[PDB]
């Protein structure tokens, strides 16, 4: 209900540690823009 | 020391420290025009069929003894490059597989990563004949066995003589890669189209065969992860079919 | 220079040994029959499964050897005997009897000789309409798995040229085969179980090696 | 009872690890011919 | 990023990113032509003494005081370089040693290496002398104490003295290495003959002695190995000796 | 691959393989000559204003939300650089700032360090106003918060809205660098002096404002340390003074 694209993250093996190492970690993730952009017809932002 | 690959819509990220092995010195190609120029006309798909498509990784745990895939009809379910299987008579194509590992400095262990030509694999019943179904599941992996097997129909599966009758040890006469936990995680193979005829119907011959095979198996200590995940990611090359029109 | 290809499967064997009457009361031992494939000799067979495409001629010799039958009537006085060696090519008529009309096609080429004289021999070149033939196929015939029909390499008859009525006589034909200008392609593991039939790959499962005393384990020197 | 040159293997040190890594360990050996090989009087294996 | 190198009928490997200390700046060499011309020829082996010999490797524990070697008779027993000891009525030649450890990156521990020319060492009896088996066992290690030794005629082998009445943290003044478990491994000592006369006889003299010590102990934790192996290997470079024609 | 810098009577020591981000491009300078010529006149200190000057090192656990730095008024009690701030009226100055870690293989972790000019901060009422004490504490660093702060005067300090009222996944915006356990330790960043006069008094304003903020918490297992220490260092850059004859 969207027509966009999606992106998806999937385990393909599974994260393996030696001893006496923590056990759980974190992803971060970046977006930004490429220098192909463009906007158009100001309008009035809808957040105040 | 990152790079990211981009065929059509897919995107990948490796190492620029890879290693690539180009099967028997051969990249694929294109059969050039005229083995048989007047009725028998190709066509080429170069659509979808050059992208990368990834299937489900693998768990590798403490006792795995190994997994196996057919090519093609592991893809015979992959977007266009399987469309392409049933609208087409015959066809070609060369293949690039990866095959990457994720695992901690705290693991260890050993894998081959081998491609085979015409695996034509023996029966648990030595005057019996072997299924279509126990040859291959698609895009789902079979499992060797660490002893041997019984049941009606089936491969025998022991994992010291691959199933065709050889010693384990001497695979590394095909096309094949080492994976050490401790130096590398990841494997790049380039197979061409390797057959008797220049091309050929899709659906009952099995061109090649991709295999797995620990000959360390893991080991982990305290609490790290008690598994490791193997993923594969193939990218077909140079397709080309019979003309429609 | 002996480890090179021609060198090392360019070699003649016996692959066939039939008996074969001139009367009988079975019918089907008045004629000996043999169809071309290397893998009932398991000398060759090992040899040849090093590759996974081959491609050559073949070179045939015949050895013929006859006697009288035991049965009872002696004093015979018998002018030397003629024999008929018939190869069919893939898609050629095969007889089922030695009166039949397939004796006599014209495209089935046929060898007339007489004993006393030099064994007789003919060569056949590479028949097939594919490119080379496989020694191993993961596939199915169209159904047999590991069966393709481009390997079909045809066949060979043999039968006494008597008239009608003839005395009896056994003879049995011994086959020496051998390939010639071969070319090969994708080497391969070397087979380590014994085979069990002629068409599979089938084998029951083996050991690696045989043991010895421990790891350390080296014998004193002489 | 060979007349045969011989390989062996000794521990210098001893293996020596951290806190959370296997204990134990394997070594492989690959073993191949060098370009001066040559072979003469072929005959009929053993093996079959 | 490994070499493989082969004197003789020996090979060994050790890694192309090596540091080498040549002690004074002299490689070894023979004495040329012309100190004694007339009736003092020498001849050279050179067949069997330019190899590898290497020793028991010794064992690092937790409390370790350290380890000496005395040069030559160390390499009494090994094969054609002791043959030549007792056939010969002078000799001289230069060394090359090599020391590597093995250990993961789990452990930590600081060794010096150190080469001493004349390294005569002290009675644990002040009015005593030193025997000649408390001087050296031949290729088994001598070992230093962590506190003062007594009993007769042993050195006084307390390590902060080194058996000679100096600091011992001021070795650093002979030819020496270290090895940082955190760093490296490996340390590999070019020695060339130093004598006060060019040739001397090698069964009543010991050159050089080759000391291997400890300033931080060896430490592990949970279920790592216990110990840590090091090895030493020993080549003779122009070895020489009085002419017997 | 190690890197020694001295200056002044000051030397310390960072890898050769840095990154250096120059905060807008602009490397620190004079203002030229002749903004105002003729009553004017500025004069340089050049004397010990150009030196390290190390605070005390902080100490990250598990649930640490961050600390914060005016500049200047960190370094009021910082020598010479101090001095000046008391017989001067007016002054401007550029920076340089290293950050580092002191951590293991076996700790993980994620932190950004960023340089924030005209850090207004809102107060914990929002009808009321922030005291002078609640801003800075000198050379002590302040804290965030992981939940939001009550009492009078002072900075409402929750940790995700960075006591000024936005996201605080935006203030990638600003000048500023990441520190991930896995890859680096360090960071440097070049400020240089901006202003919208061209001189200024050092004590009731402050120019710009340091944060160290955790994205991923610290994490370690059984026995290692429980803590890791980041310590920073300042050298001021082209100190700049009225003159005072």
């Given at each position: 209900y969207t027509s966009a694209g999606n992106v998806t993250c999937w385990y393909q093996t599974g994260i393996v540690v030696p001893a006496g190492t923590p056990t759980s970690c974190s992803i971060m993730c970046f977006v930004s823009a490429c220098n192909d952009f463009s906007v158009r017809l100001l309008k009035d932002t809808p957040f105040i | 020391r990152v790079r990211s690959i981009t065929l059509g819509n897919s995107t990948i990220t490796t190492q620029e420290s890879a290693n690539v092995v180009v099967a028997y010195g051969r990249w694929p190609e294109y059969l050039k025009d005229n083995e048989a120029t007047a009725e028998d006309q190709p066509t080429q798909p170069?659509?979808?069929?050059?992208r990368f498509y990834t299937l489900e990784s693998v768990t590798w745990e403490r006792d795995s003894p190994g997994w196996w895939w057919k090519f093609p009809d592991a893809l015979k379910d992959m977007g266009l490059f399987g469309q392409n299987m049933y609208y087409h008579y015959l066809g070609r194509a060369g293949y690039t597989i990866h095959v990457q590992c994720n695992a901690s400095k705290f693991h260890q262990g050993c894998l081959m990563v081998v491609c085979v030509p015409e695996a034509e694999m023996g029966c648990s019943q030595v005057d019996g004949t072997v299924n279509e179904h126990s040859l291959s599941e698609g895009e789902t992996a079979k499992k060797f066995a660490s002893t041997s097997t019984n049941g009606t129909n089936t491969v025998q599966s022991i994992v010291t003589n691959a199933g065709m009758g050889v010693g384990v040890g001497n695979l590394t006469i095909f096309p094949h890669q080492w994976i050490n936990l401790r130096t590398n995680n990841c494997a790049t193979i380039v197979m061409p189209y390797i057959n008797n005829v220049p091309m050929d119907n899709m659906f009952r011959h099995h061109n090649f065969t991709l295999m797995i095979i620990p000959f360390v198996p893991l080991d982990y200590s305290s609490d790290s992860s008690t598994y490791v995940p193997i993923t594969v990611t193939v990218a077909p090359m140079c397709a080309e079919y019979n003309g429609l029109r | 220079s002996e480890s090179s290809i021609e060198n090392f499967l360019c070699r003649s064997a016996c692959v066939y040994m039939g008996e074969y009457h001139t009367t009988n009361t079975d019918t089907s031992k008045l004629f000996a029959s043999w169809t071309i494939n290397a893998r009932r000799?398991?000398?060759?067979?090992?040899?040849?499964?090093?590759?996974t495409y081959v491609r050559f001629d073949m070179e045939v010799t015949f050895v013929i050897t006859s006697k009288q039958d035991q049965g009872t009537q002696l004093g015979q006085d018998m002018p030397p005997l003629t024999h008929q060696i018939m190869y069919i090519p893939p898609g050629g008529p095969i007889p089922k009897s030695v009166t039949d009309y397939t004796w006599q096609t014209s495209t089935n080429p046929s060898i007339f000789w007489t004993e006393g004289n030099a064994p007789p021999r003919m060569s056949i070149p590479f028949?097939?309409?594919?490119?080379?033939?496989?020694?191993?196929?993961?596939?199915?015939?169209?159904?047999?798995?590991?069966?393709?029909?481009?390997?079909?390499?045809?066949?060979?008859?043999?039968?006494?040229?008597?008239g009608s009525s003839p005395l009896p006589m056994t003879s049995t034909v011994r086959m020496y085969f051998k390939p010639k200008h071969v070319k090969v392609w994708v080497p391969r593991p070397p087979r380590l179980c014994q085979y069990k039939n002629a068409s599979t790959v089938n084998f029951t499962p083996t050991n690696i090696t045989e043991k010895r005393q421990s790891i350390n384990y080296i014998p004193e020197t002489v």
């Open positions: - | 170069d659509v979808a069929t050059c | 000799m398991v000398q060759m067979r090992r040899k040849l499964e090093l590759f028949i097939s309409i594919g490119n080379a033939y496989s020694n191993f196929y993961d596939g199915w015939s169209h159904g047999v798995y590991g069966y393709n029909t481009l390997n079909h390499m045809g066949q060979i008859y043999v039968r006494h040229v008597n």
